[PDB]
Design a protein around this nucleic acid. Structure first.
Ligand SMILES: [Mg+2]
Ligand SMILES: [Mg+2]
Ligand SMILES: [Mg+2]
Ligand SMILES: [Mg+2]
Ligand SMILES: [Mg+2]
Ligand SMILES: [Mg+2]
Ligand SMILES: [Mg+2]
Ligand SMILES: [Mg+2]
Ligand SMILES: [Mg+2]
Ligand SMILES: [Mg+2]
Ligand SMILES: [Mg+2]
Ligand SMILES: [Mg+2]
Ligand SMILES: [Mg+2]
Ligand SMILES: [Zn+2]
Lengths: 116, 107, 23, 45, 136, 96, 122, 86, 97
RNA sequence: AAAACUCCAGUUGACACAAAAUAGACUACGAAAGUGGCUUUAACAUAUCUGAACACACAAUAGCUAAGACCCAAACUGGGAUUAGAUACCCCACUAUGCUUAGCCCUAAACCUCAACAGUUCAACAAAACUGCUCGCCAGAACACUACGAGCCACAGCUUAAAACUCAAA
C-alpha cells in the first residue's frame, strides 16, 4: 500500500502546508534505472593474514608453511574465477527479476499517459 | 461563584435528589467536576436572571451572555497564566466581538 | 530564477555595513 | 438511568469503616488486565 | 527447534555449554570505532581476562581501522583468553566500525566459540547534540 | 420501460474492512497486546504497514505504549521474553 | 473527575503493604477523594531497575486505586506520593472507562490522488 | 543501562554459523532502521536538512512503490509473442 | 421486438454478478508453447499456463473450467490520466469439462 | 598525518536544570511564527462576509540587560595540517551563545514567493483556466534593504522612504 497523495502537495485549494516538496513531478517515467555496479571487495584478506603471520613467525620460509601459502593461492584463484562467473551471470540474467532493458521494452509497450 | 455543592446543570432535574446519600450529592456536585460545568451553571444562572426565554440560545442576547462568560474564563486564565499569548489574543478578539454584537443590539 | 538581483543587493548591504562600521 | 445505576454502586465504595477489610481483600485478590489479539479479531485471555 | 532468542535467566533451560548455563559464559566486548577496534574479554561476574586492540598489536595511526588489524587484535585477545581458560564466549559489539565482523573472525580464528551475538551500540533518543557536518 | 435499470444504493457491497482491534479497548496496562505490537529485538513500535491497523487504533497503540513504558509497565529496549510466545500478528519476517 | 492511580510499591510483606495502602487511601480521602476500588495486579519484576528514594528496586507490587477526586487535588496527591518512600512510582491519570469508545464503521479505502499535474505535453 | 543486559539485539548461533548469525543481526538492525539512524546521527543533521531528506525519501518511496506495482502488473503480459507474423 | 434493456437483463453476463470466484466453462482457441489462450465469453480472453499434470488433453477446442479472478485487469498509476489495460482477463484453470 | 590527552582507555555500578529514537508509509493543531517523551490542570474568538502603514496583540533564528545551570555543540580565538599565500575548507581545545527566570529587540528566501469570502469546469515554465465582491500593493534599470525628515526601551538598530548624475536597456 503506497503512501497517499491527497493533501501532500502545494496546490490550489489545499488548506494545509505542503507535506512533500518534489523537485521532479510524481509521474512514472517510461524507463527503469540501470543496474548499479558492485563495489570494491578486497578479497583473500583472511588467507593473506594467516600466511603473513606464518611469515613473521618463521622468518619468511615457504618450506615451513607451504600449506597456507597454497591456501592463499587457492583463494586468489577462486576469487578470480568468482569474478568471471559473477560477470557472466550478470550478463546472463538478474537474480529473481529481469534485466532493466527488457523491463524498458515492457514500459515502451505500455507507456504512462500523463496527458490526454 | 456558585457554591461547590451546587448540582450539575444536566443533573438538576432528576426527581431523586434529597433522598440520595451525601456522598452521591458530593459526587454529582460541582466541586468534583470541572470549570466547563461551572461555566455552564454560571451561564444558565445569568440566562434565568436576564432574558425572557432561557431556551432560545440563538439570539443576540444569548450570544452576548455566552461570550461574556467565556471572557470571564479567559480573564481567570490570564490571571493565573500571565504569559499566555494565545489566550490573550482570544480574550482581545472576544472583547471586540462582544463590542460588535453590543453595537448591533443597541442599534 | 537566478540570484543576480539578490547578489546586487547583497553586495550593496555588505558595503553599507562596512561603511557604517568604518564611520 | 445514570443516577440510578450510580446509586447501587456507591454501596461498594471504600470508606473509613471499610478500609482495612477492603485492603486485606484486595491483597488476597488479583485482577489481570492482560489479553491478546489474534489474526482474526478474537481475544485470547 | 532452535531459537535465536537467548535463554531467560531465572527459568529452566536445557541448553548447556561445557555444563555451564548461558548466564555465566564469559563475554567479549568489541568496541569498533571508526579509527580503532578494542576487544576486552571479561567473565560473567566482571573479572577481566583478556584485553587487546589494534594500537596494542602494533598498527599506529590509520592502519588501526582496518579489517586485518581487528583480526590480529581478536586473535591475540583469544590467545590470552585461552591462556586464562576460556572456550565458549558471548560477543557484545558496540559501534559500526570497519573491524566488527573482522574482530569476531579474529576471535574465532584464535579459537573461541561464539554462542550469542549482541549489538550494544549507543543510539540516543535525541540526547546530546553531535558534531556539525563536514564540508568535505 | 419495465426493463430499464433503476437507481438504488449498490448491492453486492462488501462491508468495510475492520482492523483487528476495531471495537476493542486499548489500555496502557494491557502489556501483552502492546508487546504484540512492539518489535521483539529492539523494542521499536511498528508502523501501519506492519501492524495493519487503522489510523485511530495506531494512534491509541502508540500512546498506550509510550505511557506504559514511562510508567514502568513495559521495557523500552526489548519485548518481554515472557510475551515472546503470543500469536504473532505483525507482517514482518526477520528470519530469512 | 474520575481518576486512576497506578501505584508501584516496594516489594514488602503483607502488614507493611497493607499499612502503605492504608496510608495512601486515607491520604486520598483527606485530600478530598472518594475511592471507588482498590485493585491488585500483583507482585512482579520491574521492566527496568527503578531507582527511587536512594534505593535500587528490581521487583515491585502493582496496585490500582480507582477513585474520584476534585480538580485541584491531583497536584497535592502527586506531592504526597513523591514524599512517600514506599511508593516506587505513583501516577494519576484520567479514567479509560470514563473516556467513551466511538463506534467505527471500518477503515475507509483511500483512492489514488488525481489531477495533481496538468495534462500538457511536458 | 537500566534494562536487562542480554535480551535486546541478541541472536544465538546455530551449530557455529557465526557469520550467518551476524548477517541475521545486521538484518534485524537494518529492518528496524537502527543502522541508518546511527549513520545519520554520526554528525548533526540540521532540522531544515532533516526535513528536506525526509521529504525526498517519502517522494522516492511513493515513486518506487508505484513503479514496482506497475512492473508486477505487467510481468504477466511479458509472455511469448502470441501472434508472431503480425 | 425485444428491447436492448430487456436483452441486457436476460443476458447471462448480467445474471453472473461480479466475476470474482465464479466457475465458468470456456474453450481453448489458441496455444503458444504452454500458454493456453482461453475464451470464457465476455469481452476478453484469458491466458493460462498449461497444467503439467495431464498436460496433453489441453488442445485447441478443449473445454476447461475457470475461476475468473477478474474480468478486464486494469489499474491507474502515479502520473496517468487513464488506466493501463492489458486487454486480458484473470482466471485460474482448474481442469476439464 | 600532525597536534592533543595519557589526572587515558575497556567492563560494571551510582548519576541531569541538557535534548526528546521508533511511532512518523501518520496530515493533525494554531492567526502567523510554530507545534511530534509522559501525566494533570486551565484552554483552542465570531449563528453574514470584507475591512486599520493614523491603533492594539503576537512574531523563527541571531542579538541586548540582569541572575542562575552546564552534558554536548559552537561564532571568536589559540594550536596542528594545507597552500605561493590560507585571516578558509580538514583535525584539536575552549568562550560568547543555544537552556531557565524577568525585561527588551521586532527581523527572515517570515515563500506554499500563489490574499479573504462565495462559486464554476491556455504567451512560456511552474502548481489547469476562470467568475462575482472587497481590501492591500505595483507601474524602465541602477542609484536604493540609500540620503534627509519622523517615530520607536531600538544608539554599528528597525520601519517609512526620495532626488541629482548615468543608461537603452534591465
Ligand atoms: Mg525545483
Ligand atoms: Mg603526537
Ligand atoms: Mg474582519
Ligand atoms: Mg495587518
Ligand atoms: Mg564540547
Ligand atoms: Mg559555555
Ligand atoms: Mg528543557
Ligand atoms: Mg523575535
Ligand atoms: Mg517558515
Ligand atoms: Mg510574499
Ligand atoms: Mg486579507
Ligand atoms: Mg533588512
Ligand atoms: Mg535605514
Ligand atoms: Zn478500526
Amino acid at each position: 500500500a503506497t503512501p497517499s497523495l491527497r493533501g501532500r502537495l502545494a496546490r490550489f485549494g489545499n488548506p494545509r502546508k505542503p507535506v512533500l516538496k518534489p523537485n521532479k513531478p510524481l509521474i512514472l517515467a517510461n524507463r527503469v534505472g540501470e543496474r548499479r555496479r558492485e563495489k570494491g571487495e578486497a578479497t583473500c584478506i583472511t588467507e593473506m593474514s594467516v600466511m603473513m603471520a606464518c611469515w613473521k613467525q618463521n622468518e619468511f620460509r615457504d618450506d615451513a608453511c607451504r600449506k597456507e601459502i597454497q591456501g592463499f593461492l587457492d583463494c586468489a584463484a577462486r576469487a578470480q574465477e568468482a569474478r568471471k562467473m559473477r560477470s557472466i551471470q550478470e550478463t546472463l540474467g538478474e537474480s529473481g527479476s529481469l534485466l532493466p532493458n527488457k523491463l524498458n521494452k515492457l514500459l515502451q509497450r505500455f507507456p504512462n499517459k500523463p496527458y490526454l | 461563584d456558585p457554591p461547590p455543592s451546587t448540582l450539575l446543570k444536566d443533573y438538576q432535574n432528576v426527581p431523586g435528589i434529597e433522598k440520595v446519600d451525601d456522598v452521591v450529592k458530593r459526587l454529582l456536585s460541582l466541586e468534583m467536576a470541572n470549570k466547563k460545568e461551572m461555566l455552564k451553571i454560571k451561564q444558565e444562572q445569568f440566562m434565568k436572571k436576564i432574558v425572557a426565554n432561557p431556551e432560545d440560545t440563538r439570539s443576540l442576547e444569548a450570544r452576548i451572555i455566552a461570550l461574556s462568560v467565556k471572557i470571564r474564563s479567559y480573564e481567570e486564565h490570564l490571571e493565573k497564566h500571565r504569559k499566555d499569548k494565545a489566550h490573550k489574543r482570544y480574550l482581545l478578539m472576544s472583547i471586540d466581538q462582544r463590542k460588535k454584537m453590543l453595537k448591533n443590539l443597541r442599534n | 530564477k537566478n540570484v543576480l538581483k539578490i547578489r546586487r543587493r547583497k553586495m550593496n548591504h555588505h558595503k553599507y555595513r562596512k561603511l557604517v562600521k568604518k564611520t | 438511568r445514570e443516577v440510578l445505576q450510580l446509586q447501587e454502586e456507591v454501596k461498594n465504595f471504600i470508606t473509613r469503616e471499610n478500609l482495612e477489610a477492603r485492603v486485606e481483600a484486595a491483597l488476597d485478590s488479583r485482577k489481570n488486565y492482560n489479553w491478546a489479539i489474534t489474526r482474526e479479531g478474537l481475544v485470547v485471555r | 527447534k532452535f531459537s535465536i532468542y537467548p535463554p531467560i535467566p531465572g527459568e529452566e533451560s536445557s541448553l548447556r555449554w561445557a555444563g555451564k548455563k548461558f548466564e555465566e559464559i564469559p563475554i567479549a566486548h568489541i568496541k569498533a570505532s571508526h579509527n580503532n577496534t578494542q576487544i576486552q574479554v571479561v567473565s560473567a561476574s566482571n573479572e577481566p581476562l583478556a584485553f587487546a586492540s589494534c594500537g596494542t598489536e602494533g598498527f599506529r595511526n590509520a592502519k588501526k581501522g582496518t579489517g586485518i588489524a581487528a583480526q590480529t587484535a581478536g586473535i591475540a585477545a583469544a590467545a590470552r583468553a585461552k591462556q586464562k581458560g576460556v572456550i565458549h564466549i558471548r560477543v557484545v559489539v558496540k559501534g559500526l566500525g570497519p573491524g566488527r565482523l573482522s574482530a569476531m573472525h579474529g576471535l574465532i580464528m584464535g579459537g573461541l566459540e561464539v554462542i550469542s551475538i549482541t549489538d550494544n551500540t549507543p543510539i540516543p533518543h535525541n540526547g546530546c547534540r553531535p558534531r556539525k557536518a563536514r564540508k568535505l | 420501460n419495465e426493463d430499464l435499470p433503476i437507481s438504488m444504493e449498490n448491492p453486492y457491497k462488501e462491508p468495510l474492512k475492520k482492523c483487528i482491534l476495531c471495537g476493542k479497548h486499548v489500555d496502557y496496562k494491557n502489556v501483552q497486546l502492546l508487546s504484540q505490537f512492539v518489535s521483539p529485538f529492539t523494542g521499536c513500535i511498528y508502523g501501519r504497514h506492519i501492524t495493519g491497523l487503522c489510523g485511530k487504533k495506531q494512534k491509541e497503540i502508540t500512546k498506550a505504549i509510550k505511557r506504559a513504558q514511562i510508567m514502568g509497565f513495559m521495557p523500552v529496549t526489548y519485548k518481554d521474553p515472557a510475551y515472546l510466545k503470543d500469536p504473532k500478528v505483525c507482517n514482518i519476517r526477520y528470519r530469512e | 473527575p474520575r481518576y486512576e492511580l497506578a501505584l508501584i510499591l516496594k516489594a514488602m510483606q503483607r502488614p507493611e503493604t497493607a499499612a502503605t495502602l492504608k496510608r495512601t487511601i486515607e491520604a486520598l480521602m483527606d485530600r478530598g477523594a472518594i475511592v471507588r476500588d482498590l485493585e491488585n495486579l500483583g507482585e512482579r519484576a520491574l521492566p527496568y531497575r527503578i531507582s527511587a528514594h536512594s534505593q535500587q528496586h528490581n521487583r515491585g507490587g502493582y496496585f490500582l486505586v480507582d477513585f474520584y477526586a476534585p480538580t485541584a487535588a491531583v497536584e497535592s496527591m502527586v506531592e504526597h506520593l513523591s514524599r512517600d518512600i514506599d511508593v516506587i512510582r505513583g501516577n494519576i491519570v484520567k479514567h479509560p472507562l470514563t473516556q467513551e469508545l466511538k463506534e467505527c464503521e471500518g477503515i475507509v479505502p483511500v483512492p489514488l490522488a488525481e489531477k495533481l499535474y496538468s495534462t500538457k505535453k511536458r | 543501562a537500566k534494562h536487562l543486559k542480554f535480551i535486546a539485539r541478541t541472536v544465538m548461533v546455530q551449530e557455529g554459523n557465526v557469520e550467518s548469525a551476524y548477517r541475521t543481526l545486521n538484518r534485524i538492525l537494518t529492518m528496524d532502521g537502527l543502522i541508518e539512524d546511527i549513520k545519520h546521527r554520526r554528525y548533526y543533521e540540521k532540522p531544515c536538512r532533516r526535513r528536506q531528506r525526509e521529504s525526498y525519501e517519502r517522494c522516492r518511496r511513493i515513486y518506487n512503490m508505484e513503479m514496482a506495482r506497475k512492473i508486477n502488473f505487467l510481468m504477466r503480459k511479458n509472455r511469448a509473442d502470441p501472434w508472431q507474423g503480425c | 421486438v425485444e428491447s436492448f434493456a430487456s436483452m441486457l437483463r436476460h443476458s447471462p453476463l448480467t445474471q453472473m454478478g461480479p466475476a470474482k470466484d465464479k466457475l465458468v466453462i470456456g474453450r481453448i482457441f489458441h496455444i503458444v508453447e504452454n500458454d493456453l489462450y482461453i475464451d470464457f465469453g465476455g469481452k476478453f480472453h484469458c491466458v493460462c499456463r498449461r497444467p503439467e499434470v495431464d498436460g496433453e488433453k489441453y488442445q485447441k477446442g478443449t473445454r476447461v473450467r475457470l475461476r475468473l479472478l477478474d474480468l478486464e485487469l486494469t489499474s491507474r498509476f502515479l502520473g496517468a490520466t487513464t488506466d493501463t489495460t492489458v486487454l486480458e482477463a484473470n482466471a485460474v484453470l482448474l481442469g476439464i469439462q
